Structures are given as C-alpha cells and as structure tokens.
Design a protein around this ligand. Structure first.
Ligand SMILES: [Mg+2]
Ligand SMILES: [Mg+2]
Ligand SMILES: [Mg+2]
Ligand SMILES: [Mg+2]
Ligand SMILES: [Mg+2]
Ligand SMILES: [Mg+2]
Ligand SMILES: [Mg+2]
Ligand SMILES: [Mg+2]
Ligand SMILES: [Mg+2]
Ligand SMILES: [Mg+2]
Length: 74
RNA sequence: AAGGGGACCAGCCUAAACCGUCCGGCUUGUCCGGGCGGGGUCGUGGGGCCCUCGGACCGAAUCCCCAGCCUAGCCGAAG
C-alpha cells in the first residue's frame, strides 16, 4: 500500500517521500500516529504542488541574492 | 429463443473533462476537499478544451383553460 510519509522514518524512508508497505501497517500504525497519509491521487497533487512552492521560493532566493551580488562587487 | 403476424408506441435526466461561486481544512495556494450553478450525455463513437467559418424552427410525461365523461335527474307515439 503506497503512502506519503510525513516524517523521517527509520529504515522505511524520507519525509515527503512515497513508499509501499503492507496495508495493516499503513492502516493501523502509520496513519493513526500521523506519520503518513494515503498515497492517493487527490493528495498526490498536494505533495506535488508544495514541491513546486518550495522549489519556487528557493530558487527565487538565489535570484534576488544573485541580483544583489551584481549590484555589489561592482 | 431468433424470426414472422399483431396491440400499443416515446423517449429522456445525470456522473466525469473544463469553467464559475459560496464554504472549511492546515501542509498557504496554480492546494485538497464539500455545496450550488454553467457545460455534457454518445457507438455513424461522443463530449471538454483551442483555432477558422455559420447565427428561427421544434417542444413536453409539467402547468393552465376547455370539450367529453361520472356522481341526482327529465321529455317520451297510440283504445
Ligand atoms: Mg417476438
Ligand atoms: Mg413482432
Ligand atoms: Mg387489442
Ligand atoms: Mg472538489
Ligand atoms: Mg475548487
Ligand atoms: Mg467546486
Ligand atoms: Mg473525439
Ligand atoms: Mg420529462
Ligand atoms: Mg313518461
Ligand atoms: Mg305511455
């Protein structure tokens, strides 16, 4: 059963990452303890969109940073 | 059972794409979701979206009116 992890998890996987595990573990451990959610399509969009936002504001930093580089140095 | 002879006869509304708006969630938006509206309904495949061109006839199974009918009756030839 595919699920997206909410936390860095011992020898299962990384925060934000999508993994495959036996149904009961998802249903009766992970999901209730809030360490993950169903890797559904509906909130696969949510993941994919935040990935976009974190990539948006980060390289946006390197943009305004590099622009202040050019002002200075000269 | 198909087929043939007949009775009767009538076909429609949605879901999804996409678009709009209200609402709440927390993981703040090109977000996910739930309402309502618009769009759409097909098998010669159909629909959405994007370009070019084209710009009144139909019509209910709903509603209203009326005939007709039902729920009392009446006229009715000639010892
Ligand atoms: Mg027959
Ligand atoms: Mg027949
Ligand atoms: Mg008959
Ligand atoms: Mg929705
Ligand atoms: Mg919406
Ligand atoms: Mg909506
Ligand atoms: Mg087509
Ligand atoms: Mg109808
Ligand atoms: Mg009499
Ligand atoms: Mg008499």
């Amino acid at each position: 059963m595919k699920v997206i992890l909410l936390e860095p998890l011992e020898n299962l996987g990384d925060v934000g990452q999508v993994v495959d595990v036996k149904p009961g573990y998802a249903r009766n451990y992970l999901l209730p303890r809030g360490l993950a959610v169903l890797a559904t399509e509906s909130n696969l969009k949510a993941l994919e969109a935040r990935i976009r936002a974190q990539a948006k504001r980060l390289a946006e930093r390197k943009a305004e940073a590099e622009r202040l580089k050019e002002i200075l140095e000269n």
